[PDB]
């Protein structure tokens, strides 16, 4: 998204009690929906905003410069199969490779 709005992500990303703040606002709890509040309806509005970051916004679409590939079904016909770039996968394999190449436990 917009990089100047990264303060909301660093606001929600903390571990304040034992878990994530978005993980708190996603579950209905007595500690949740009241701390960022003096009235209940604006708290409901703020939480209904804050939980929607994990959902796709808009109609599903891939651009003309995105890739999409016919796959032959066994009977007949095709599916369109637009793939994406898995950034959690690349980041996890990147952390493992950086551990195996520059880690102190391997350099020893």
């Amino acid at each position: 998204g917009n990089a100047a709005a990264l303060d909301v992500f660093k606001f929600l990303s903390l571990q304040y009690q034992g878990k994530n703040l978005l993980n708190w606002l996603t579950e209905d709890s007595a500690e949740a929906l009241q701390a960022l509040s003096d009235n209940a309806e604006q708290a409901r509005e703020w939480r209904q905003a804050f939980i929607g970051i994990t959902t796709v916004k808009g109609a599903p679409a891939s651009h003309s410069l995105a890739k999409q590939l016919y796959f032959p079904l066994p009977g007949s016909g095709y599916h369109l199969l637009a793939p994406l770039f898995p950034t959690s996968l690349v980041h996890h394999v990147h952390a493992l490779l950086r551990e195996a190449r520059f880690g102190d436990a391997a350099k020893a």
Partner: protein
Amino acid sequence: VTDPEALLLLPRLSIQNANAISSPLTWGFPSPGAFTGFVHALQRRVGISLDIELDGVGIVCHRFEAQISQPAGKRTKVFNLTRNPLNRDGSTAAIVEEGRAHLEVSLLLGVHGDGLDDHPAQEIARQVQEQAGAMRLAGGSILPWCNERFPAPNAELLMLGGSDEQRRKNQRRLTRRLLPGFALVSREALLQQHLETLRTTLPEATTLDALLDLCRINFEPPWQVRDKPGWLVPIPAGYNALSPLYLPGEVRNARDRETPLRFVENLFGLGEWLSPHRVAALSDLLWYHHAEPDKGLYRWSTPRFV
């Protein structure tokens, strides 16, 4: 799935700019899905006109030359790019790194259908080579062999042999023809039992970790390297679903509005490069499609191998 009644051999194909980025995790030889899509486009374009069903591919890869370059003072490599045209103002466009490579593969495509007795085998092989000469394999132009020493013609081996001696003889005559290469097969049960052994050693183990362990070279304390059987590589083994399937005219900016779309993501399996006489059966080693679309799992492999 289906045993091919014939096994047609496309000869050494020169491909000049293949997509060397096989997956978001692997560079190198292009994906097996490219070759299966190539033979399905061949089926789509002449497999209807000749009353056949081209199915399965044997990948050989005689010669591979990637357009990479090692920068000075680093262990890893980078890619040599191409110069894009300018925008409408004269500034340079933002470059997207695409890896190129020069291949030399031979394709063993298995053909079966009622068109075998309608036509001579040499005529249908000649027609499928003339159709292959105007296509592209993984994004690269198929160089059609002009003014060289002698063009390599095709050979459609009828798999139904009069004898087992005749079958082994004609198989050996093919294996001599595609010998300097290295056939690529999928070995997933080996990855599964390696997952089993590594989870015996240490629990909660992913098989991404097992694929990483079978990819790398790793030393052991008494220093010696740990042996690997053969040339094991990681390959993209098809796709896995993310979104539920949508209706054909529902997704915005699709490639087609008659075909349902589904957002997918890669699946990284394990392949192996063997010398072609090691398999001792060329009726297998062909890469088929396995869809089962109700759970995603649009994937390719080679059954009947081991």
